[PDB]
Amino acid sequence: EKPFIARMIHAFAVPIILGWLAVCVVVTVFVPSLEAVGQERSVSLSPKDAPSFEAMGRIGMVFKEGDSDSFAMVIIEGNQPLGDAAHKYYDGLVAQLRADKKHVQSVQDLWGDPLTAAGVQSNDGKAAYVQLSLAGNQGTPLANESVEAVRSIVESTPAPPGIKAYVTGPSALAADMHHSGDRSMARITMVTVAVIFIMLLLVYRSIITVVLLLITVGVELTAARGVVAVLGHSGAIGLTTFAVSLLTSLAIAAGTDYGIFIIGRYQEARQAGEDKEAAYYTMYRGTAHVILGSGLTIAGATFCLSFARMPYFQTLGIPCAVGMLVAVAVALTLGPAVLHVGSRFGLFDPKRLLKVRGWRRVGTVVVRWPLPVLVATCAIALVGLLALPGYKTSYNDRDYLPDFIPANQGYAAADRHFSQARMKPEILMIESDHDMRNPADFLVLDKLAKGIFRVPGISRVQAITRPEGTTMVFKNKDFQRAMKSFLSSDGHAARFIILHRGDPQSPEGIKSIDAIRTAAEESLKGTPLEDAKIYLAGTAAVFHDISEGAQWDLLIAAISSLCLIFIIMLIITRAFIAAAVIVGTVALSLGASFGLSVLLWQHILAIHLHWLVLAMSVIVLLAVGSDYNLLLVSRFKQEIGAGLKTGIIRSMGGTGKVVTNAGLVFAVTMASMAVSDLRVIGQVGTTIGLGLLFDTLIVRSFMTPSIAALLGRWFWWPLRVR
Amino acid sequence: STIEERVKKIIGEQLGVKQEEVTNNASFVEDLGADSLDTVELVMALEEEFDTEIPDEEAEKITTVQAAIDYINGHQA
Numbered sequence: 001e002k003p004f005i006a007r008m009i010h011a012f013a014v015p016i017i018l019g020w021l022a023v024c025v026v027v028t029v030f031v032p033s034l035e036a037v038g039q040e041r042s043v044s045l046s047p048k049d050a051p052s053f054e055a056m057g058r059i060g061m062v063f064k065e066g067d068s069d070s071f072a073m074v075i076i077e078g079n080q081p082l083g084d085a086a087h088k089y090y091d092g093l094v095a096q097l098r099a100d101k102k103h104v105q106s107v108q109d110l111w112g113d114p115l116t117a118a119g120v121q122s123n124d125g126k127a128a129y130v131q132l133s134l135a136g137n138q139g140t141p142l143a144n145e146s147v148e149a150v151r152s153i154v155e156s157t158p159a160p161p162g163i164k165a166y167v168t169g170p171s172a173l174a175a176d177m178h179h180s181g182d183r184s185m186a187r188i189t190m191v192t193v194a195v196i197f198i199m200l201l202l203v204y205r206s207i208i209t210v211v212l213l214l215i216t217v218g219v220e221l222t223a224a225r226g227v228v229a230v231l232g233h234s235g236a237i238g239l240t241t242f243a244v245s246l247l248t249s250l251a252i253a254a255g256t257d258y259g260i261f262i263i264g265r266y267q268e269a270r271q272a273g274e275d276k277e278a279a280y281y282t283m284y285r286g287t288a289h290v291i292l293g294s295g296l297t298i299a300g301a302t303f304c305l306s307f308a309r310m311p312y313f314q315t316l317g318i319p320c321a322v323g324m325l326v327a328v329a330v331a332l333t334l335g336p337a338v339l340h341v342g343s344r345f346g347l348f349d350p351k352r353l354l355k356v357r358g359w360r361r362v363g364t365v366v367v368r369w370p371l372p373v374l375v376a377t378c379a380i381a382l383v384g385l386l387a388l389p390g391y392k393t394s395y396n397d398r399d400y401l402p403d404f405i406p407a408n409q410g411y412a413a414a415d416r417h418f419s420q421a422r423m424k425p426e427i428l429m430i431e432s433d434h435d436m437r438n439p440a441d442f443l444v445l446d447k448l449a450k451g452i453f454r455v456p457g458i459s460r461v462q463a464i465t466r467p468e469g470t471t472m473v474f475k476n477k478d479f480q481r482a483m484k485s486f487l488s489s490d491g492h493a494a495r496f497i498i499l500h501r502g503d504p505q506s507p508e509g510i511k512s513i514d515a516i517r518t519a520a521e522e523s524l525k526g527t528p529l530e531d532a533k534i535y536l537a538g539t540a541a542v543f544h545d546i547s548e549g550a551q552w553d554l555l556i557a558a559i560s561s562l563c564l565i566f567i568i569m570l571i572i573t574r575a576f577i578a579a580a581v582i583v584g585t586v587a588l589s590l591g592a593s594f595g596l597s598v599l600l601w602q603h604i605l606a607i608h609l610h611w612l613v614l615a616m617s618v619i620v621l622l623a624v625g626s627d628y629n630l631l632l633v634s635r636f637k638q639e640i641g642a643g644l645k646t647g648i649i650r651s652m653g654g655t656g657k658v659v660t661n662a663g664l665v666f667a668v669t670m671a672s673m674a675v676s677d678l679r680v681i682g683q684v685g686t687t688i689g690l691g692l693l694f695d696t697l698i699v700r701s702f703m704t705p706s707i708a709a710l711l712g713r714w715f716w717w718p719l720r721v722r
Numbered sequence: 723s724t725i726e727e728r729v730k731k732i733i734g735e736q737l738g739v740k741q742e743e744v745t746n747n748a749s750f751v752e753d754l755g756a757d758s759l760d761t762v763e764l765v766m767a768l769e770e771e772f773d774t775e776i777p778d779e780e781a782e783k784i785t786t787v788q789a790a791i792d793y794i795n796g797h798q799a
């Protein structure tokens with residue numbers, strides 16, 4: 001049989017090649033580079049419905065401390081106790097920062113006040129800092145512009161001798177994370193292509209076939225990146241450096257996998273003795289639907305991230321799905337077309353011999369004695385859960401960027417002279433219709449401050465009644481400036497600046513948020529301010545919410561992706577238990593990938609996994625593992641009719657080397673993102689790489705064939721097979 | 723065509739043996755250099771060439787090609 005679309009691609013091959021190339025050039029010229037769009041259409045880090053976001057907005061609006069979620073800390077450091085020259089320079093800097101109303105919405109200038117100066121000066125006296133509130137939420141282009149403007153102002157002001165200034169804070173850290181992620185993109189792609197070229201040259205052993213495969217992959221990659229850039233430029237989608245990097249790597253790996261499937265089936269058909277036209281038609285009949293299933297599975301898996309809560313997951317839905325729906329159509333059309341055009345000149349005939357003796361022997365060893373093999377590999381797959389009790393997630397984005405980053409460099413200026421919690425303050429605000437100016441409510445405020453000072457892990461409570469944060473007046477001249485910054489202008493609300501001992505952001509620190517809330521409630525209970533509203537904001541509260549939401553979004557994304565992949569495989573194969581197995585044998589095998597990744601990062605390298613890693617890696621692992629299993633099961637579907645068990649052996653003999661090559665190429669592509677400056681991207685890539693090595697070496701090789709041999713004809717229920 | 727022709731076909735395909743090379747008098751292990759797993763795969767393949775299951779102990783009677791032909795001409799029933 002010669003299927004229709006195969007005939008049409010066969011007749012119009014050269015026009016198709018030139019059409020896709022023209023589209024590539026048109027898109028690359030008529031819209032900017034995708035990374036440039038990412039820095040033009042980036043998303044805000046915080047979700048909108050988070051209490052830690054509403055609280056910060058409310059505090060900012062009530063206390064007139066701007067209208068943004070973002071805040072940035074300016075650090076002043078010196079090689080000696082800061083003299084009056086430091087104060088003059090700081091006054092000039094704060095005046096200039098105030099002049100820039102477009103970006104700096106407010107400046108919590110405390111070091112300029114001799115009274116509260118002790119509350120921000122380093123205990124050594126060699127450093128000081130001031131909190132700025134910048135327009136635009138964390139990570140948005142407005143915040144990026146604001147942090148760049150503040151940084152330029154700080155670093156252009158003439159520093160006195162022996163004094164240095166830095167900029168820090170979540171906003172600057174996010175901006176620098178974006179810029180460093182887009183700075184390493186060229187290197188990621190260069191190393192990916194170099195490694196693939198060094199690898200594929202040892203598989204096909206002729207440079208022409210490798211070069212044509214890589215050109216097909218490049219056309220796919222550029223078309224996908226270009227379409228996603230078009231959508232981003234049109235404003236229909238947000239973006240993040242994670243989305244761009246994952247899209248690039250996934251497009252490269254998946255395009256190489258489709259090209260490898262195409263060439264592998266064509267070369268097997270040629271080795272069997274079929275001529276060029278019949279070989280191409282067999283290639284299409286045996287790989288056209290496998291590639292489409294592979295594309296839709298990955299697209300609908302990465303699309304399931306669109307249901308996540310956190311923006312760092314929610315924004316990976318549309319861009320990745322569009323990139324994979326583009327890279328697949330280009331694969332399905334340029335692949336067969338370029339294959340046929342090259343077949344005119346005899347480029348894609350196999351140079352080596354497609355020896356299959358080893359895989360047929362393994363197939364007869366696994367089909368015979370299926371259940372022992374299934375048990376033997378289920379033991380390996382499930383022992384990866386032993387790392388679960390010791391798994392510890394780290395929320396400190398500060399550590400996963402290079403030390404030369406200006407934001408990270410500024411943080412070092414705090415560690416050298418401050419406790420590591422000073423640059424991560426947490427703010428508690430109480431609001432009521434009463435006027436807090438009255439002395440009785442001031443005693444209530446003091447009771448609240450004392451109560452929260454008792455909370456574990458809390459070191460300092462800088463408040464209206466605690467100008468320097470330590471234990472100790474409403475009419476004094478210096479105390480008036482405390483009114484100007486620690487009570488609302490109407491007197492209806494009061495804010496408490498809270499500092500921790502140790503990192504507030506760590507899993508230990510964030511749990512204190514509930515303790516702080518409870519202690520505040522006990523202090524306010526049985527008191528006239530009991531009716532006063534309470535809000536919590538800062539890094540601690542923010543990442544407490546992130547910890548709460550990440551579990552749910554990971555779970556929902558994983559479950560939805562599993563169901564969608566199952567539906568796609570059921571459509572492709574039309575066998576219920578078959579489709580169930582194709583994805584179940586991968587879901588069970590997620591334990592091995594998780595265990596290996598934890599054992600490599602957390603235990604061996606002593607680097608905890610970033611909270612993004614599992615969510616961004618499981619979605620790809622499910623899809624790609626199910627794709628390899630789909631290839632194998634579709635080959636079963638083909639070869640069956642020569643015996644239910646013998647077809648399994650023949651199918652392994654045929655597709656054994658193809659899937660190994662595709663799996664190694666994909667895993668090494670994902671494992672090549674460790675080169676990225678964002679160590680978070682490195683963790684994601686390495687987790688997916690280890691997982692897919694496990695799949696391609698064990699799951700599809702022993703689990704699926706063993707289950708197929710065990711289930712007899714029930715593997716294809718309801719399909720009637722003799 | 724006849725049973726013998728296509729059992730010959732499967733033996734040849736399993737062992738990589740040429741059509742003119744395989745013969746009734748030849749033995750799988752010595753003359754054709756067949757492996758033990760090759761014999762297991764070959765018997766399993768005949769189990770689906772004809773709907774007849776061969777017990778493991780019954781696989782002791784498959785030493786040579788002529789034995790396979792004469793065994794399966796009767797056990798095809």
Ligand SMILES: CCCCCCCCCCCCCCC/C=C\C(=O)N(O)CCCC[C@H](NC(=O)[C@@H]1COC(c2ccccc2O)=N1)C(=O)O[C@H](C)CC(=O)N[C@@H]1CCCCN(O)C1=O
Nearest residue numbers: 003004005006288289292293296571572573574634637638
């Ligand atoms: C979510 C993505 C899903 C898969 C899409 C595949 C995309 C590649 C397009 C290749 C070129 C074909 C174009 C037309 C397709 C439209 C349907 C159509 O025109 N019709 O409806 C006729 C019914 C008989 C089909 C016939 N199939 C058969 O007669 C039976 C049924 O399945 C098989 C079979 C399947 C795979 C491998 C070996 C097989 O023996 N034998 C067979 O030639 O294939 C199919 C052409 C393609 C195929 O591979 N799958 C079919 C797809 C839909 C029908 C049922 N269904 O669910 C499938 O699996």
